[PDB]
Each structure stands twice: as structure tokens, then as C-alpha cells.
Ligand binder design. Structure first.
Ligand SMILES: O=C(O)[C@H](Cc1ccc(O)cc1)NC(=O)[C@H](Cc1ccccc1)NC(=O)[C@@H](S)Cc1ccccc1
Ligand SMILES: [Ca+2]
Ligand SMILES: [Ca+2]
Ligand SMILES: [Ca+2]
Ligand SMILES: [Ca+2]
Ligand SMILES: [Zn+2]
Length: 316
């Protein structure tokens, strides 16, 4: 929409008040003109037709419960855009400031969020397994990272390349969470998962096995469910990423952590420079070692830690 850029105020899914960038033209629209070609948030109105209607509001105040998921999807997409620009110097997901679109209130009681190759989509959850998925910053960053992956490595969504695709989204979703410093952790989806149970999360990077996911290649899922276990085998890569950053001893193998920043640097480089659509776990290890070498030298501790981390999770 063509209008005047302004700032509205609202309350997110978790009840927190935040300011959002909107556009004015008769109505106030969830259209942020301050980032690239814009950030647009749509109302799917509980249906499955996409993208739906560009979110319109009469007074620039978003405190209605219906508004909550829109506020967060819009706000978190901005934070995620900032992370990629400021930290990795990438302009939007395509690297050329492509408009970012998200639709909320997708379907009825839909327990998921996703990147469909064109935009992000968020369900409201059934109120038990999940509350509106855009309420979690690691969720929003996870979905937008899929867009980055689409325009770079293009990791096919199945088997090992799919598990890598998923892990990259969990890894960058977590780095964005730390970046915004929103009660950061190495857990995935803790803010929107199971509103009745506290202290749990959908997945864990620090300890994947906590929620039944493999933390070692010998324990990888080899079946056909979940596109060959993309949300299962990602635990192996998530564990490796956690080890590279924080360090620790896993299955007797010791890893000296090099921190989050270098983790982000190494993985972003591997993703955009070395990974291809069919890359498997072994190739990711080679990509990660190569990236750390490019950035820090072959005799660097950074290269050493990447090797130990993959050794620790059994990926040769
Ligand atoms: O496995 C998934 O798809 C789970 C959803 C799930 C999990 C358990 C459950 O009982 C029901 C639904 N989705 C995801 O992990 C994340 C959402 C999320 C991220 C971070 C934190 C929390 C949630 N979504 C995905 O991975 C999307 S990208 C998977 C997908 C692809 C294509 C079409 C539809 C869905
Ligand atoms: Ca309003
Ligand atoms: Ca958190
Ligand atoms: Ca988290
Ligand atoms: Ca919970
Ligand atoms: Zn995903």
C-alpha cells in the first residue's frame, strides 16, 4: 500500500507491549517500510487461502487478542531482518531486499508454521500443543531462515539434506533469539509450546535426546516418516552446533567452544558458499571445516573445534 510510514503500538502473544512499524492510508496497515522492500503481515482469517488480506487497523493500536499473532509475526520478522543485515550483511532472504510476507490465523487450530517458498505462514495452535506460533522468536527466525536457504544452498527437503535444512533453521532461529536477547537459550519453541507445561520445549540443541531426538549419527532415523526424519535427524547437527559454540564432552569426545558469533559466521559461510541442494551430513562437515579454514586458518582452534564437534556426533 502507498501511504505514510508511522509507528503503532500493540501487545504480542505473550502479553508484551511493543511498537511496530505501520503504514497509513485511510487505515493503518501492518506494512513496515523501513526494512528493504518492506515487511507485510496478512490476515488469513482462519482459512487456507494465501496470503489473505494485508492487515488493516483503524487506530494504529493493536491490543485486541485477534491482533496478538500479527503483532509478533510483524515485529519478529523485522528483528530477524535486522540480524541478517547487521550480523551477516545480507539484505533480506534473497540478498536483494525482497519483501517479507507473513500470514497469521492460517486455518483453525493449526499446530505449525512454515515457509512455503513465497511467504511465511503461522497457525494459531490448538491452545494445548501450541499457542499462536509467531509468539516465539525462534519460530519466526526458523521460518525466515528457510527462505535464506531456498535462495542459497537449496537443500532438498528430505533425508540428510532436509535434516541439514531444518538444523540450519533451528541454529539461526536460536542465534536470532540470542541477538534479540529475548530470554535466550538453546531450546527450540519453548515460548509457544505446551502452554500447560513449563520448562519444556519442542526440541533442544543442548540435549536433543531430552525430547527423543538423536544426538549421534549412529542413532539416526532411517525411515520415511517426517520426510525421512528432517525434524528428527536435525538433532545430530543441532548438537554439533551447540558443541562448537559452548563446548563440552559428548560420548567421550571433548570440544572447546568458540562462541555463538563464530558459530554463526562459520555456518552462514558454509550455507551460502559451500552447501548444495543434495549435501549430506558428511559434506556439511567438510563445508564447515572449509569455512572455518577460510575465516581462521587451518591451524586455528576454530577449525579444531568444528572437527571435534562433528567427531563427537559421529559425523565423519
Ligand atoms: O514437526 C513439525 O513440523 C513442527 C510442528 C509440530 C511439532 C510437534 C507436534 O506434536 C505437532 C507439530 N514444526 C516445527 O518444528 C517448525 C515450527 C517451529 C519452529 C521452532 C519452534 C517451534 C515450532 N516448522 C517447521 O519446521 C516447518 S518449516 C515444517 C513444514 C514444512 C512444510 C509444510 C509445513 C510444515
Ligand atoms: Ca486497533
Ligand atoms: Ca527463550
Ligand atoms: Ca529458544
Ligand atoms: Ca510448555
Ligand atoms: Zn522448518
Amino acid at each position: 500500500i502507498t501511504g505514510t510510514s508511522t509507528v503503532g503500538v500493540g501487545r504480542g502473544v505473550l502479553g508484551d507491549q511493543k511498537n511496530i512499524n505501520t503504514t497509513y492510508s485511510t487505515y493503518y496497515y501492518l506494512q513496515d517500510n523501513t526494512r528493504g522492500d518492506g515487511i507485510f503481515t496478512y490476515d488469513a482469517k482462519y482459512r487456507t487461502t494465501l496470503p489473505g488480506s494485508l492487515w488493516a487497523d483503524a487506530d494504529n493500536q493493536f491490543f485486541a487478542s485477534y491482533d496478538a499473532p500479527a503483532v509478533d509475526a510483524h515485529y519478529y520478522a523485522g528483528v530477524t531482518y535486522d540480524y541478517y543485515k547487521n550480523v551477516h550483511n545480507r539484505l533480506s532472504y534473497d540478498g536483494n531486499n525482497a519483501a517479507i510476507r507473513s500470514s497469521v490465523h492460517y486455518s483453525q487450530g493449526y499446530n505449525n508454521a512454515f515457509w512455503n517458498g513465497s511467504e511465511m505462514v503461522y497457525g494459531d495452535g490448538d491452545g494445548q500443543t501450541f499457542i499462536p506460533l509467531s509468539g516465539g522468536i525462534d519460530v519466526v527466525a526458523h521460518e525466515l531462515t528457510h527462505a535464506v536457504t531456498d535462495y542459497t544452498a537449496g537443500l532438498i527437503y528430505q533425508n540428510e539434506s532436509g535434516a541439514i535444512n531444518e538444523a540450519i533453521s533451528d541454529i539461526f532461529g536460536t542465534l536470532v533469539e540470542f541477538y534479540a536477547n529475548k530470554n535466550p537459550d538453546w531450546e527450540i519453541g519453548e515460548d509457544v509450546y505446551t502452554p500447560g507445561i513449563s520448562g519444556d520445549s519442542l526440541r533442544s540443541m543442548s540435549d536433543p535426546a531430552k525430547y527423543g531426538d538423536p544426538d549421534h549419527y549412529s542413532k539416526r532415523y532411517t525411515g520415511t516418516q517426517d520426510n525421512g526424519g528432517v525434524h528428527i535427524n536435525s538433532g545430530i547437527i543441532n548438537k554439533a552446533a551447540y558443541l562448537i559454540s559452548q563446548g563440552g564432552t559428548h560420548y567421550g569426545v571433548s570440544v572447546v567452544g568458540i562462541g555463538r558469533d563464530k558459530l554463526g559466521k562459520i555456518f552462514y559461510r558454509a550455507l551460502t558458499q559451500y552447501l548444495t541442494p543434495t549435501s549430506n551430513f558428511s559434506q556439511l562437515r567438510a563445508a564447515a571445516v572449509q569455512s572455518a579454514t577460510d575465516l581462521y586458518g587451518s591451524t586455528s582452534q576454530e577449525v579444531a573445534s568444528v572437527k571435534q564437534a562433528f567427531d563427537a556426533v559421529g559425523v565423519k
